[PDB]
C-alpha cells in the first residue's frame, strides 16, 4: 500500500516507506491571471522539476529543538535559476519531499514543516510549530515526508530577489537513539519541485 | 456581521460605511471537519 | 412644531465594546481582490481542534522516557488550562484570554521507539475528591482509564472528559488553595520490553465539543 | 482510537469511545470577526502618527490575537483624544499633506473624535511578519492604514471591523515558573 | 411621554469631507437656463485620455533631436507620475492630487522631419530589477519593445503597461532611495538617413484603463 | 498603432497591440461632482466678505481643480466661525443691506455656523478667467455668491454642491529642479 | 448625487435645499469614447 511515485516534469521519485501527501493551506493555486500583471504573464513548464539539497546531519548529540531551515527559493543553477535572473516577477507553489534514511532499529522523531514568512522562533514557540503544514519522520515507521503548498503572499507576483515567502524547516522532536544494529548518523536530504511557475516582465540582458 | 447589535439598517450607504470588496473559502473548517473519528481495527464491545 | 426628545442621563458614553458603529468620512474605496485566498480560518477553536501541540514535561521536553524502576508513574498533571505542563500549548494560549470553558480535551500519545522495543501504557483520569493522587496502576485502575500497546499504528487518542458540578469551569487556579477543582491525569507505564531510552511524545488539542465563553485579557502590560 | 501519527492527519476522538456522550457546543465567543471587534489602546502616540495595527501591545487580546495570524484584512475605527484639529491622510500620501485642511479634518468636539476609516493599502492582504526587505526587524513602509496628525494626541484607540485572518502562527501563554500550575487572584465577593 | 434619545460621545463633530448636507436658509431660487452648453466634461480622466500633452526633455523642449553618434539612446525616463520629464504634463497635474494609480500610460511620438529625411526608432519598457539601465538597443531588445519607421503616417502610439506586484502603485517617489519601484523607459534611435537636425516630439496621455484612487492635496500653501 | 498626428484626432491604443489584456477600471474618485464636493478654507477673511470661489488657494485640491476649468456652476455650503450674528446678502444687494436683520441672519451657536447657500448670480454659468473689462487682472464684480458680515470672522470654509465644469484649462504640477524625479517623505510606520 | 451618503430622503424639500434648474450633454466623454484604437494598415500576427 505504502508505495508512492511522484512525477514532476521529466523526473520521478519512488518511495516504498511513504505515509501520504500533506496539502498545506489549500489543494491548488488561486487565480493566476490578475489585474496587476496586465495579462502579460506566461507559464514556464520547463522549470517544474526536482532539485536536491542537503539539510543537516542528524546525529545523537542534537537535543530537542534543533531547528534547521531552508528559505525557498534557494540558489538554483538550472532553468529556475535563469528564470529568477531573467524575468522580473515570478510566482510558484512548492512540492517538497524530505528523506532521512537510517534503519528500522533507530529511534527518534523529526518534525518537517513548511513555514510562511519565516521569523526566528523563541525557545518557547517551538512547542507549537505543529500549526504549520507538517509531517513526521520516524525511523520506526517511515523515511519520507511529503508536503505540498500553494503560493501565498501579500502580492500576487513576487520578486524572489527581495522576498522569499516559504521556508522548509526540520526540528528534532525526539533525539536519535541508536543501538548496535542501527545507523550511527543520519543525513537529511531534501527534494523540492516548483509547480505552476508563472513569470512576467522580462528584463534586459547582461551579455 | 460580527459584534453589531443595531436592528435598524445603517444610516449611511454600504459605499460610505466601509470599503467595497471586488472579485475575479474557509480552509481550517474543512480540515477540522474531516478529522478522523471513531475507532480503528476491530472492536469487542 | 418639531420632534421633542429627552436627552437621557447615563447613556451615550463610549463603551469600548459597544455594538454600534461610527460615522464615515471617506467613501467609495474598492479593495483589491482576494477571492479564494489560501489558508483562512474563522474560528480559533477549529484551529485548536485540527492542530495538536506539544506539552512541556520536565526540563522542557515534550516526551516522557521509559523508566527502569518499580515505580511506574511516568507523569501527572492537573486538568487545568493554566497547568504547568500546558504552559506552551496553543490551547492554553487561547484559553488564557477567556473566563470559562467546557467540554472534552484530547491527548495524543505518539511512540517514537525503534522497531525492536515494545511497551504498554495506561492513562487514567482521576477526578477530584482524593487527597493524594495514586502512585501505582493497581490503585488507579478504578478510575476512567485506557491502555494501549505499541505496534504498527503508533498513536493513541484519549478524550479527557468534562465531569464537574457546574456546567462551566474556570480557566485559572483561583488562590493559594491546592488540590485543583478538576482532577488530575496520570500517565503510567505498565511494562516495557527492551526500550531503555526510547521516548513517548505527548500533545494536546481541543475536543469535538470544547467551548470558551467570556472574553477577557489578564496579561499585564 | 489508534492511527499512524506520522501521517499528520487530524484525529478527533470523542467520549463515545468509552460510553460517554458528546454534548452540544456553542462557539460564538471564539469567532474571529467577533473576538477581533473591540477597541484597544495604542501606546505610541505623538504629534503625528502612522496608524499601524502592529503597534498594539503584543499581550493584549486583539493585539496578541492579531500577532497569531500571518495575513489579515479589516477596515478600521479610531477614537482619538486631541487638542486642535485632526487631519487624516490615506496610505501613501506625502507627510506634508498632513498639514492641509483639504484632507479629512475633524474639528474637535468636547469629549473626543470617533472616526471610521476604510482599508486603503494597495496590497490585497497585509501581513504581520515579512521575510525579506523592500528597499533597493520591520515590515515594509506600505503596511499601514494611513496617518493622523493633531497638535498633540493624548489617547488613540483602534477597532478592526470585518476582520479576516489567514495562516495562523504560534500563540503563547505566560510561563509557570516552579509551581504545579499558575495561581493568581480571582475576583471574589468582599468580606 | 416623549421619545428618549442618548446623545452619543465622539459623534457629530465637523469632518470636512462628511457625506451629509446642511440646513437651508434661502429658498425658491430658479437658475438661468444652460441646456446643451458646449464643452462640458464630467471626469478628469476622460479629459486626460482625449488630449495628449507634451513632455519636458533637456532645456525644456518637448522634442528629441536625431544625434550623430555611436551611442543611440535618445532619452530615458522613469515610469513615475512624478518624474522630471512628466513635470509639465496634464496627467501628472491630476495625479499629484491622488495617492495611488493603476493602468496603462500611452506615449505618442510624432515625427517632424522634412520629406527628404528618414529615421527608424525603437521604444522599450525596462522593468525594475536591473542595476544599470541599458545603453544600446542590442541589449535592451530583450524587454517589451516596439519599432517604427517614418513615412506617410507620422505618429506612433506605445502603451506603457502596468506590470507590478501590488495591484496599485504610489504616485510619488518615496525617499532618497533610488532605482524607482517601477522600471524606466528608454527611447532609442536605431538609424537615420539625412536627418541631421530634424526632431521627434513626444507626448503622453492616459490609457484605456487608467485609474486614480485616493484624493489628497500635498501642495504646500 | 500608426496615424496622422496632425489630424489631432484622439488615439487610445491599448495593450492588446502586443499580446496584453486591458483590465477593468473604476473611476469614481476622479469624478467631477465627487472630487469637487469637499470643504476648503478661504484665507481672505475680514469683518465683511464677498464669497468668491476664486479666493481659494491656487494649489489646494478644490481650488486648483476649479482653476483648471473655464466655466463652472455649483450651489454652495459655508462654515463660518464668528463672534456675533452672521448676516448674508445675495448677489447684487447694496453693501449697506449687510447691516440689517431682515436678511438671512444666523445667531451664533457654540461651535460655529454651517449654512447652505443657493447659486444667485445672474449669469447662466460663472467663469474663472474673463477676457476684457466690464466698466464703461480681475473678474467682473458680478462673479460671486453673495456676501457675509459679522463682527469678526475667524474661519470660513466653502463647499461646492452639484458642481458642473466646462472648457478645461492647463493644470500644473510642482516642477522638479535637478533630480531625476521628485522625492519627498511618505508616511511610514514609526521605529 | 456625488458625495452624499444618507439613505433617508432629505428633510427639506427640493425647492429649499438647493436652487432649481430651468430648461428651454457631456462632450469630452463623446470625444474620448470615439478615440481610434486597434491598428492601422496590414497585420502579420
Chains G and A are in contact, defined as 3 or more C-beta pairs closer than 8 angstroms: no
* Nearest one of A2, A63, A103 to C116, comparing CA atoms: A103
**DSSP, residue by residue, chain C:** ----EEE-SS-S---TT-S---EE-----BPPP-TT-SSEESBHHHHHHHS-EE---GGG-SEEE---SS--EEEEEESSTTBSTTTTSHHHHHHTTBSEEES-EEEEEEE---TT-EEEEEEEEE-BTBSS---SHHHHTTSEEEEEE-SSS-EEEEEE----SSSSEESSB-SS--S-SS-EEEEEEEEEES-SS-EEEEEEEE-TT-EE--B------
Q: Phi first, then psi: what are they for G28, rounded to 5°?
A: -65, -25
Handedness of CA C14, C19, C23, C29 (dihedral sign): positive
The answer to whether C198 faces chain A, any CB pair under 8 Å, is yes
CB contact under 8 A, D91 and E174: no
Torsion angle of C-alpha atoms E50, F177, E82, D120, degrees rounded to 10 = -130
CB contact under 8 A, C32 and E4: no
Distances (CA, A) of A175 to A128, C58, C154, D5, E70: 18, 16, 17, 17, 68
Partners of F28 on chain C (C-beta within 8 Å) are 28, 30
- Residue found by looking up cell 503510567 in the block: C188
Contact of E169 with E182, CB cutoff 8 Å: yes
**Angstrom distance (rounded) from CA A155 to CA A164:** 12
Residue B11: count other Cβ atoms within 10 Å of its Cβ: 16
Distance between the two ends of chain G, CA-based, in angstroms? 46
**Angstrom distance (rounded) from CA E95 to CA E181:** 17
Which residue of chain D is at minimal alpha-carbon distance from E179?
A: D136
CB contact under 8 A, C39 and B17: no
Q: Is A4 helix (H, G, I), strand (E, B) or coil?
A: strand
Q: Which residues in chain E (131-170) have CB-CB distances under 8 A to chain A?
A: 133-134, 139-140, 142-144, 161-167
Partners of G7 on chain B (C-beta within 8 Å) are 9-13
Contact of D109 with E10, CB cutoff 8 Å: yes
Grid coordinates in use for C188?
503510567
Which residue of chain C is at minimal alpha-carbon distance from G3?
A: C27
Partners of F21 on chain A (C-beta within 8 Å) are 38-40
Burial category of E169 from C-beta neighbours within 10 Å (exposed 0-12, middle 13-18, buried 19 and up): buried
CB contact under 8 A, A174 and C201: yes
CB contact under 8 A, B27 and A25: yes
**Angstrom distance (rounded) from CA C130 to CA C134:** 9
Among candidates E16, E170, E220 on the partner chain, residue whose Cβ is nearest the Cβ of D104: E16
Domain membership of residue B10 as a residue range: 1-45
- Residue found by looking up cell 521604444 in the block: E123
Q: CATH number of the domain that B10 lies in?
A: 4.10.90.10
**Angstrom distance (rounded) from CA A49 to CA A10:** 7
CB contact under 8 A, G37 and E208: yes
Chain C: list its partners (3+ Cβ pairs within 8 Å).
A, B, D, E, F, G
Distances (CA, A) of F83 to E24, F44, F97, F111: 21, 17, 19, 11
**Angstrom distance (rounded) from CA C2 to CA E183:** 63
**Angstrom distance (rounded) from CA C20 to CA C25:** 16
Partners of B32 on chain D (C-beta within 8 Å) are 10, 12
Which residue of chain D is at minimal alpha-carbon distance from B2?
A: D34
Among candidates F15, F19, F23 on the partner chain, residue whose Cβ is nearest the Cβ of A35: F23
Grid coordinates in use for A166?
516559504
Q: Is F105 helix (H, G, I), strand (E, B) or coil?
A: strand
* Nearest one of E212, D138, D133, D161 to F188, comparing CA atoms: D138
**Angstrom distance (rounded) from CA D168 to CA D170:** 7
Grid coordinates in use for D110?
468636547
The alpha-carbon gap from B14 to the nearest alpha carbon of chain C, in Å, equals: 9
Distances (CA, A) of A83 to A173, A205, D70, D133, F118: 37, 12, 28, 21, 64
Partners of A127 on chain C (C-beta within 8 Å) are 53-56, 62, 88-89
The alpha-carbon gap from E170 to the nearest alpha carbon of chain D, in Å, equals: 6
Resolution in A: 3.6
Report the domain count for chain B: 1
List the single best residue of E43, E45, E133 to mutate versus F (max F Cβ within 10 A): E43
Q: State the pairing for strand pair C53-54/A107-116.
A: unpaired
Strands (E), A77-163: 87-99, 107-116, 134-137, 144-149
Among candidates F3, F38, F181 on the partner chain, residue whose Cβ is nearest the Cβ of E155: F3
Partners of D9 on chain B (C-beta within 8 Å) are 35-36
Distances (CA, A) of F145 to C53, D54, F74, F91: 71, 48, 10, 6
In sequence order, what are the beta bridge partners of A187?
Answer: A57
CB contact under 8 A, D22 and C209: yes
- Residue found by looking up cell 482532577 in the block: C183
**Angstrom distance (rounded) from CA A205 to CA E142:** 7
Grid coordinates in use for F169?
484649462
The alpha-carbon gap from D126 to the nearest alpha carbon of chain C, in Å, equals: 11
In sequence order, what are the beta bridge partners of E54?
Answer: E203
Angle D50-D51-D54 from CA coordinates, rounded to 5°: 110
Which residue of chain A is at minimal alpha-carbon distance from B31?
A: A25
Partners of C94 on chain B (C-beta within 8 Å) are none
Q: Is A89 helix (H, G, I), strand (E, B) or coil?
A: strand
The alpha-carbon gap from C108 to the nearest alpha carbon of chain D, in Å, equals: 9
CB contact under 8 A, C51 and D157: no
Q: Please state whether the peptide bond connecting residue A73 to the residue before it is cis, i.e. omega within 30 degrees of 0.
A: yes
Partners of D3 on chain B (C-beta within 8 Å) are 36, 40
Among candidates D79, D90, D122 on the partner chain, residue whose Cβ is nearest the Cβ of E216: D90
Contact of A55 with A163, CB cutoff 8 Å: no
Residue E30: count other Cβ atoms within 10 Å of its Cβ: 11
Chains G and D are in contact, defined as 3 or more C-beta pairs closer than 8 angstroms: no
Partners of C27 on chain G (C-beta within 8 Å) are 3, 5
Report which secondary-structure segment, H or E, holds E185.
Answer: strand E184-193
Q: Is A146 helix (H, G, I), strand (E, B) or coil?
A: strand
Order of strands, edge to edge, in the sheet holding D105-106?
Answer: D48-50, D147-149, D86-89, D105-106
Amino acid at each position: 500500500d505504502r508505495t508512492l511515485t511522484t512525477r514532476n516534469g521529466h523526473t520521478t521519485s519512488t518511495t516504498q516507506s511513504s505515509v501520504g501527501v500533506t496539502y498545506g493551506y489549500s489543494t491548488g493555486e488561486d487565480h493566476v491571471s490578475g489585474p496587476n500583471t496586465s495579462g502579460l504573464e506566461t507559464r514556464v513548464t520547463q522549470a517544474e522539476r526536482f532539485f536536491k539539497k542537503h539539510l543537516f546531519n542528524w546525529t545523537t548529540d542534537k537535543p530537542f529543538g534543533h531547528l534547521e531551515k531552508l528559505k525557498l527559493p534557494t540558489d538554483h543553477k538550472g532553468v529556475y535559476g535563469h528564470l529568477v535572473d531573467s524575468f522580473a516577477y515570478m510566482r510558484n507553489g512548492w512540492d517538497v519531499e524530505v528523506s532521512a534514511v537510517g534503519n528500522q532499529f533507530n529511534g527518534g522523531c523529526l518534525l518537517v514543516a513548511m513555514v510562511p514568512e519565516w521569523k526566528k522562533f523563541t525557545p518557547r514557540e517551538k512547542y507549537q510549530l505543529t500549526l504549520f503544514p507538517h509531517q513526521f519522520i520516524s525511523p520506526r515507521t517511515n523515511m519520507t515526508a511529503h508536503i505540498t503548498v500553494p503560493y501565498l503572499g501579500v502580492n500576487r507576483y513576487d520578486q524572489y530577489k527581495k522576498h522569499k515567502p516559504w521556508t522548509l524547516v526540520v526540528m528534532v522532536v525526539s533525539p536519535l537513539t541508536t543501538s548496535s544494529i542501527g545507523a550511527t548518523e543520519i543525513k537529511v536530504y531534501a527534494n523540492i519541485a516548483p509547480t505552476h511557475v508563472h513569470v512576467a516582465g522580462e528584463l534586459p540582458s547582461k551579455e | 456581521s460580527g459584534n453589531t447589535g443595531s436592528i435598524i439598517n445603517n444610516y449611511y450607504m454600504q459605499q460610505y460605511q466601509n470599503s467595497m470588496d471586488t472579485q475575479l473559502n474557509d480552509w481550517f473548517s474543512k480540515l477540522a471537519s474531516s478529522a478522523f473519528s471513531g475507532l480503528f481495527g476491530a472492536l469487542l464491545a | 412644531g418639531i420632534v421633542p426628545v429627552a436627552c437621557s442621563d447615563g447613556y451615550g458614553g463610549l463603551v469600548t465594546t459597544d455594538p454600534k458603529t461610527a460615522d464615515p468620512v471617506y467613501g467609495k474605496v474598492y479593495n483589491p481582490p482576494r477571492t479564494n485566498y489560501p489558508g483562512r480560518f474563522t474560528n480559533l477553536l477549529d484551529v485548536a481542534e485540527a492542530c495538536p501541540t506539544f506539552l512541556c514535561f520536565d526540563d522542557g521536553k515534550p516526551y516522557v522516557v521509559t523508566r527502569e524502576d518499580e515505580q511506574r508513574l511516568l507523569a501527572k498533571f492537573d486538568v487545568s488550562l493554566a497547568a504547568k505542563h500546558m504552559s506552551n500549548t496553543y490551547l492554553s494560549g487561547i484559553a488564557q484570554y477567556y473566563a470559562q470553558y467546557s467540554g472534552t480535551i484530547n491527548l495524543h500519545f505518539m511512540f517514537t521507539g525503534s522497531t525492536d522495543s515494545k511497551a504498554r501504557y495506561m492513562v487514567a483520569y482521576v477526578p477530584p475528591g482524593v487527597e493524594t493522587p495514586p502512585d501505582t496502576p493497581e490503585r488507579a485502575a478504578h478510575c476512567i482509564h485506557a491502555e494501549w500497546d505499541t505496534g504498527l499504528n503508533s498513536k493513541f487518542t484519549f478524550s479527557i472528559p468534562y465531569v464537574s458540578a457546574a456546567d462551566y469551569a474556570y480557566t485559572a487556579s483561583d488562590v493559594a488553595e491546592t488540590t485543583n477543582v478538576q482532577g488530575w491525569v496520570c500517565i503510567y507505564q505498565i511494562t516495557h520490553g527492551k526500550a531503555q531510552n526510547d521516548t513517548l511524545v505527548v500533545s494536546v488539542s481541543a475536543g469535538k465539543d470544547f467551548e470558551l465563553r467570556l472574553p477577557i485579557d489578564p496579561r499585564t502590560q | 482510537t489508534t492511527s499512524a501519527g506520522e501521517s499528520a492527519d487530524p484525529v478527533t476522538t470523542t467520549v463515545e469511545n468509552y460510553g460517554g456522550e458528546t454534548q452540544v457546543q456553542r462557539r460564538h465567543h471564539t469567532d474571529v470577526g467577533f473576538i477581533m471587534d473591540r477597541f484597544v489602546k495604542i501606546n505610541n502616540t505623538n504629534p503625528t502618527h502612522v496608524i499601524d495595527l502592529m503597534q498594539t501591545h503584543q499581550h493584549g487580546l486583539v493585539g496578541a490575537l492579531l500577532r497569531a495570524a500571518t495575513y489579515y484584512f479589516s477596515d478600521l475605527e479610531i477614537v482619538v483624544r486631541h487638542e486642535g484639529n485632526l487631519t487624516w491622510v490615506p496610505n501613501g500620501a506625502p507627510e506634508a499633506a498632513l498639514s492641509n485642511a483639504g484632507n479629512p479634518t475633524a474639528y474637535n468636539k468636547a469629549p473626543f473624535t470617533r472616526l471610521a476609516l476604510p482599508y486603503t493599502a494597495p496590497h490585497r492582504v497585509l501581513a504581520t511578519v515579512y521575510n525579506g526587505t523592500s528597499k533597493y526587524t520591520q515590515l515594509p513602509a506600505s503596511f499601514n492604514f494611513g496617518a493622523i496628525r493633531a497638535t498633540d494626541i493624548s489617547e488613540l484607540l483602534v477597532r478592526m471591523k470585518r476582520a479576516e485572518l489567514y495562516c495562523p502562527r504560534p500563540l503563547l501563554a505566560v510561563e509557570v515558573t516552579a509551581q504545579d500550575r499558575h495561581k493568581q487572584k480571582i475576583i471574589a465577593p468582599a468580606k
